[PDB]
């Protein structure tokens, strides 16, 4: 587990599983839009199951106040993942809370994100984004499954 | 020691923020002006501070002349002046400062002015953080016979920053939102010829 | 006394005395020193070749293949964050351009991204500033080196002892050839991360 | 008493260090200028101190005119200005001072600025002790109509000296290193006619 | 009050408040007062003749030979560091040109540089300021004098009682002729050193 | 023994013996070049053996940061010893630590020099020089040895 | 200069008249003095 900025917040909704092909670019989700006054945290949980003959490396990281240059439950696909579609370079995305989904090693990553806003209480404002970037392209031998699924689980924490 | 890289020192040494030429004018306060300071501020998401402005005035060619001026500050909610002889120049709710040209520059501060608790350089939703507006004119009913140009210097004091974010490398296009040139993306680093050297 | 009516920039009456600003809140995550930012690993750009400008997504990793013979040089780069090159793409290198003099130690971490059934060995050697790049693996082994096998561990960290502002050069060798069973991909990629230690400092302010 | 010959008193009473005429200019700080002070500094090997400059400005013929100026200081590592309208004059990392001509002279200090622990007047090896650079210009986009000349006075405070060395008697040739005229060596003392008087 | 907006040279806002200068170290050897410099012996130039300008390496010593008869004057010079002459070549004389008024005592030391088998005697006499140079050795002996023989001792020191800023004149006589055995050189040289005592002071500052 | 500036530092290398003729001018050595990160002191020891029928006077003295107007183990020969080949006059060389090699008296001189530099730790920088100047020219009767040798011994102290 | 780096004894006959050099170990490619 990784706690965003070391501050605890004070059901199990499962979104659709995106398919990771050999030429995919990335995906991102906005919160709390994806689950559709307000004050609540979250517990993001991403799992990527694949055989031992596959290789790759994902990079899941939150990004508060992620403006672009309302997807919904389905999500969206980035166009230029090198500049994160917002001008900021991908090579320094590690500043924000993050995790690695190295397929040679553990295939699960969970992030605890508390409430981060300039007002104590808040439907038109999206707090933070959740980016999944295939830093290392996925490869396999012929005859294996051509698509490796990824599952995202969202659990509200300390809602009010 | 480590005091040379603190957040307070990193946002000091007041520099030029805008230049105005009057051969009345309105200049709204906007830190997201010159790209040198915009990239430095864009490092963090939430910032809280106050400013301290200084107006050095002089005619072109540099010579000074005994003329009387009036710099007027407008809070975020107020009607901005629209003429040389409007009632805005006379209403007393918004303060103003009088100083002659042949005098030391007028130094004035401005507190942390926002309904929220910190400025937001990045807003994801739809409609907010206006800081005010300065108005400059030459006092008198007749027309002044001398052209003036003044440059505004601004400092930052009592700086607090939150939620660091990655820096920016692509060139800027607009002063309000971050669109880049999505067809000629420039790489961050330089280029070698073969990865052995 | 001399020195009056002068406007020194590096040095006030309030305009709204009656105003009471909004009290602050406890927004989580606050930076007091910029050193807390330069202490997190970030992806290096070692594959800074001239042919990746068109497609810049392949510059974050360098490959290892079965075609390469044993005892052959794989990659090499210097260890100067201020100078242009691979260190331009990290937060430490970007922030070091705002300052003039810096000193302290560094650490570099690698991460294998191959299949689970691939094994081998790679030698990572760092030479101190002043000298020459090793010409042979046997020459490189005598100096400071770390033997890394990705069949057991997936990430190793090499710590640079001391840098200051004639630069140290790091190398990555081929201890053993890349072995792989039948039915697994023949190419693997390595990503390198860099970060500063707990004694990095900067002295003078500058503008990029 | 013995306080009249201490090291602190011996390096006081700020004197002229350079004269600049502008009928923009750059003047790098160099204590090894006028030979009167160079010989005094060359007595010791390592010296540590800070300076306090003063700029008295006036047009030729001595008369004063109401003109606004800008003295700009450049740290050792920085790009020096190369034109009247460069971005160096606008970057805020290197401080600057604004003062009108019809005013008391601008007094400004500068701390002990060196990566090492003390200045080195004598270096035996191959490549270091630069102290900065001052730039002077008249504020304004147009061309000033009045010629100016200013002279810079510099003081020394908190002086510490190490490793005394023999003085110098031969005339100087270059401002950077000590070559003499190795064919017309001048003796130190005068000459008698016979050693009995 | 009168006396404002005036720039008195013999009398400040920092330009970089955020800068922290490098802390000092313990470089060995530090001077707190210039008196510690004027308290070390330095070579005098007594042979300041007009024929040594071409070859100035012979002005640091004056010779003694067997050709000179007994009871004959050898060398003589004044004892005024400020005035031009032999005292120009010493550190005390060079530093005294930076000041106006000086006072205190002095000491002068000689050093024989002849062979080991050479013996003899020389009389050194100093006359107080006000009077005349002695015309005979018998006249000089009555005043302040020190009998020096280089067959036993190799260096003697004569201390000047008091000088101030009509100058004292020192003399060196020939007590006995220069004797030497067969097979040894017939000429010997003497070097003179001068230094200040523990009560030398200077008052006003000047420029050379 | 004489300790340079009264500060102790905190094998026996013997250099080649220079020959002192009747018309020699002088010699000088640079340190720590003559023995070829770095921090060390030194213990210089100069001996000049001659018969009792010779006469002369040497002047051995160190000089920190001695610039000229890399000799090595052999050394070098000054051109204008009166101005020390650097502009400074010889008559005030006594300010630096020194000793006399008066042949009528003792013929050995040892100097202890500590580390003197502006940085705690340092191959291209020479710290100090070691000058040997024949202030009084050497003379002898005919038939004696025409060259008197001088030996220099260097011993590093508190090296690191 | 090559010989000085090894085991050596500096002997001056102006002060001492006899010096002794001790060979560390011999056995029965021989040491040379």
């Amino acid at each position: 587990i990784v706690i965003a900025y070391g501050e605890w917040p004070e059901r199990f909704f499962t979104l659709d599983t995106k398919s990771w092909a050999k030429d995919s670019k990335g995906w991102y989700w906005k919160f709390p839009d994806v689950l559709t006054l307000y004050r609540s945290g979250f517990c993001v949980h991403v799992q990527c199951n694949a055989s031992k003959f596959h290789q790759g490396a994902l990079l899941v990281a939150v990004l508060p106040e992620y403006v672009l240059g309302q997807p919904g439950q389905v999500g969206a696909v980035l166009t230029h993942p090198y500049v994160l579609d917002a001008g900021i370079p991908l090579s320094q995305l590690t500043v924000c809370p993050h995790q690695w989904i190295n397929l040679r090693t553990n295939n699960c990553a969970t992030i605890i994100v508390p409430y981060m806003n300039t007002v104590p209480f808040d439907l038109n404002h999206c707090n933070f984004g959740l980016l999944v970037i295939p830093v290392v392209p996925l490869d396999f031998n012929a005859g294996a499954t051509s698509e490796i699924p990824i599952t995202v689980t969202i659990a509200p924490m300390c809602a009010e | 020691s480590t005091q040379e890289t603190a957040i307070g020192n990193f946002f000091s040494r007041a520099g030029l923020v805008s230049i105005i030429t009057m051969p009345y004018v309105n200049w709204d306060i906007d830190l997201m002006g010159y790209a040198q300071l915009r990239r430095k501020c864009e490092l963090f998401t939430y910032m809280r501070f106050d400013a301290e402005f200084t107006f050095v005035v002089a005619k072109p060619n540099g010579v000074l002349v005994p003329q009387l001026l009036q710099y007027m500050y407008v809070p975020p909610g107020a009607p901005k002046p629209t003429s040389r002889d409007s009632f805005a120049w006379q209403t007393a709710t918004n303060p103003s400062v009088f100083v002659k040209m042949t005098d030391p520059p007028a130094q004035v501060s401005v507190p942390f002015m926002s309904p929220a608790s910190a400025y937001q350089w990045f807003y994801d939703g739809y409609p907010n953080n206006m800081m005010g507006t300065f108005s400059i004119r030459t006092v008198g009913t007749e027309k002044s016979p001398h052209s003036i140009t003044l440059r505004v210097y601004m400092r930052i004091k009592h700086v607090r920053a939150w939620i660091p974010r990655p820096l920016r490398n692509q060139p800027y296009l607009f002063k309000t939102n971050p669109n880049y040139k999505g067809n000629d993306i420039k790489c961050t680093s330089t280029s070698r010829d073969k990865i052995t050297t | 006394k001399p020195g009056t009516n002068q406007f020194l920039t590096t040095d006030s009456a309030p305009i709204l005395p009656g105003f009471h600003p909004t009290p602050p809140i406890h927004i989580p995550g606050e930076v007091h020193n910029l050193l807390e930012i330069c202490r997190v690993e970030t992806i290096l750009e070692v594959n800074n070749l001239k042919t990746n400008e068109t497609t810049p997504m392949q510059r974050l990793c360098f490959p290892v293949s079965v075609q390469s013979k044993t005892g052959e040089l794989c990659a090499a780069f210097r260890a100067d964050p201020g100078r242009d090159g691979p260190w331009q793409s990290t937060i430490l290198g970007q922030l070091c351009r705002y300052y003039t003099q810096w000193s302290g130690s560094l650490e570099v971490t690698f991460m294998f991204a191959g299949s689970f059934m691939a094994t081998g060995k790679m030698l990572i050697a760092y030479t101190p500033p002043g000298g020459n790049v090793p010409a042979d693996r046997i020459t490189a082994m005598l100096g400071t080196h770390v033997i890394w096998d990705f069949g057991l561990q997936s990430s190793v960290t090499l710590v640079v002892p001391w840098i200051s502002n004639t630069t140290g050069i790091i190398t990555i060798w081929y201890q053993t050839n890349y072995v792989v069973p039948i039915g697994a991909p023949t190419t693997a990629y390595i990503v390198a991360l860099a970060a500063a230690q707990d004694n990095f400092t900067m002295k003078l302010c500058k503008d990029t």
Side-chain angles (χ1 to χ4, degrees), chain A residues 1-6 8-9 12-15 17 19-21 24 26-46 48-51 53-64 66-69 71-90 92-98 100-104 106 109-115 117-122 124-138 140-146 148-159, chain B residues 1-2 5-21 23-29 33-35 37-51 53-58 60-79 81 83-84 86 88-99 104-123 125-129 132-141 145-156 158-174 176-180 182 185 187-192 195-197, chain C residues 2-7 9-10 12-19 21-29 31-35 37-38 40 42-44 46-47 51-52 54-66 68 70-71 73-79 81-82 84-96 98-100 102-131 133-140 142-151 154-157 159-181 183-197 199-202 204-206 208:
Chain A
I1 67 186
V2 49
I3 312 189
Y5 314 106
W8 279 90
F12 271 161
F13 299 88
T14 294
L15 314 179
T17 84
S19 163
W20 179 11
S24 178
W27 312 269
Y28 71 91
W29 293 271
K30 304 286 207 69
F31 283 68
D33 184 1
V34 83
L35 289 186
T36 297
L37 271 182
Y38 208 50
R39 166 177 188 86
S40 78
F42 281 106
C43 165
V44 194
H45 194 103
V46 168
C48 174
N49 44 57
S51 54
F53 281 12
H54 287 99
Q55 60 177 120
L58 295 174
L59 173 46
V60 47
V62 309
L63 182 42
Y66 175 44
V67 84
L68 261 66
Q73 175 225 300
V74 156
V77 179
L78 295 168
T79 321
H80 316 275
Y82 181 54
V83 296
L84 278 187
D85 215 317
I88 54 196
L90 160 68
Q92 330 164 227
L93 184 51
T94 325
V95 186
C96 316
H98 74 305
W100 290 88
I101 279 303
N102 224 355
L103 251 54
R104 134 179 289 282
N106 79 348
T110 166
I111 299 156
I112 307 307
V113 47
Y115 193 62
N117 204 15
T118 64
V119 278
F121 283 81
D122 186 299
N124 83 356
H125 188 242
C126 303
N127 266 323
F128 59 90
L130 173 87
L131 307 142
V132 169
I133 286 277
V135 158
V136 176
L138 169 140
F140 47 69
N141 262 134
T145 38
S146 64
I148 280 80
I150 49 195
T151 313
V152 190
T153 279
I154 291 315
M157 262 187 198
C158 307
Chain B
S1 269
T2 81
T5 170
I7 209 62
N9 158 9
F10 191 64
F11 281 104
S12 64
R13 305 165 321 278
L16 176 58
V17 156
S18 178
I19 175 156
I20 319 171
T21 301
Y24 92 108
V25 305
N26 290 290
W27 170 75
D28 43 18
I29 305 185
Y34 289 7
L37 162 53
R38 182 150 139 94
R39 194 175 111 107
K40 217 200 279 183
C41 282
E42 254 182 349
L43 175 59
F44 313 103
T45 309
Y46 309 134
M47 262 176 58
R48 171 206 197 85
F49 62 93
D50 57 349
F53 293 82
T54 294
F55 311 95
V56 301
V57 81
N61 165 42
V63 282
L64 295 171
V65 59
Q67 185 120 13
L68 185 93
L69 295 174
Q70 159 172 28
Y71 319 124
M72 161 178 218
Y73 181 53
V74 165
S83 90
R84 185 176 179 83
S86 168
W89 299 102
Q90 272 151 69
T91 184
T93 73
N94 37 5
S96 173
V97 54
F98 295 79
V99 57
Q107 183 144 90
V108 56
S109 152
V110 47
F112 164 56
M113 259 178 21
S114 165
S117 178
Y119 291 91
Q120 262 196 241
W121 306 125
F122 292 104
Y123 194 78
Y126 303 91
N128 45 92
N129 70 338
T133 287
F134 273 98
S135 298
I136 291 101
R137 87 153 168 175
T138 81
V139 154
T141 87
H146 295 153
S147 285
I148 88 163
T149 89
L150 87 163
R151 27 190 76 190
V152 183
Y153 290 90
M154 141 175 158
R155 214 174 75 210
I156 307 202
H158 315 139
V159 191
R160 326 199 44 192
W162 287 282
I163 274 150
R165 81 199 289 101
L167 281 158
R168 183 165 167 99
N169 61 85
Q170 292 294 323
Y172 285 99
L173 279 194
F174 306 114
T176 82
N177 63 347
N179 289 337
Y180 50 89
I185 278 164
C187 324
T188 317
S189 45
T190 60
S191 300
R192 281 135 75 158
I195 171 185
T196 280
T197 85
Chain C
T4 68
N5 289 337
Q6 62 156 336
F7 179 40
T9 80
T10 88
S12 63
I15 209 180
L16 301 179
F19 196 26
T22 326
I25 327 169
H26 181 66
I27 301 158
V31 285
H32 293 196
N33 200 358
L34 271 199
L35 279 204
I37 287 328
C38 309
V40 288
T42 46
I43 299 160
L44 256 179
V46 197
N47 220 33
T51 75
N52 311 296
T54 84
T55 65
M57 257 297 264
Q58 329 165 240
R59 337 187 70 203
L60 311 167
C61 40
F62 53 97
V64 286
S65 64
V66 313
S68 295
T70 181
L73 176 48
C74 175
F77 54 96
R78 337 196 64 103
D84 68 323
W87 292 83
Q88 263 194 60
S89 90
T90 166
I91 185 93
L92 171 62
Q94 283 303 0
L95 261 202
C96 283
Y98 281 150
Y99 284 80
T100 297
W102 56 81
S103 64
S105 34
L106 285 189
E107 80 203 7
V108 181
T109 85
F110 300 88
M111 161 165 308
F112 192 57
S115 178
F116 186 74
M117 311 285 278
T119 49
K121 265 171 192 293
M122 301 265 288
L123 180 133
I124 293 152
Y126 154 70
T127 84
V133 54
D136 255 20
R137 188 203 59 82
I138 185 52
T139 298
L142 324 167
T144 296
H145 71 285
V146 166
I147 277 288
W148 174 34
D149 48 338
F150 36 88
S154 64
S155 64
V156 298
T157 81
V159 47
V160 175
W162 191 261
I163 81 167
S164 309
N165 172 276
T166 174
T167 85
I169 170 154
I170 213 168
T171 62
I172 290 166
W173 294 94
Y174 260 94
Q175 182 48 254
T176 64
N177 58 341
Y178 190 57
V179 78
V180 61
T186 178
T187 46
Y189 283 30
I190 299 191
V191 284
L193 319 171
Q197 281 258 321
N199 46 64
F200 209 73
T201 63
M202 294 159 243
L204 244 182
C205 263
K206 183 169 71 172
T208 178

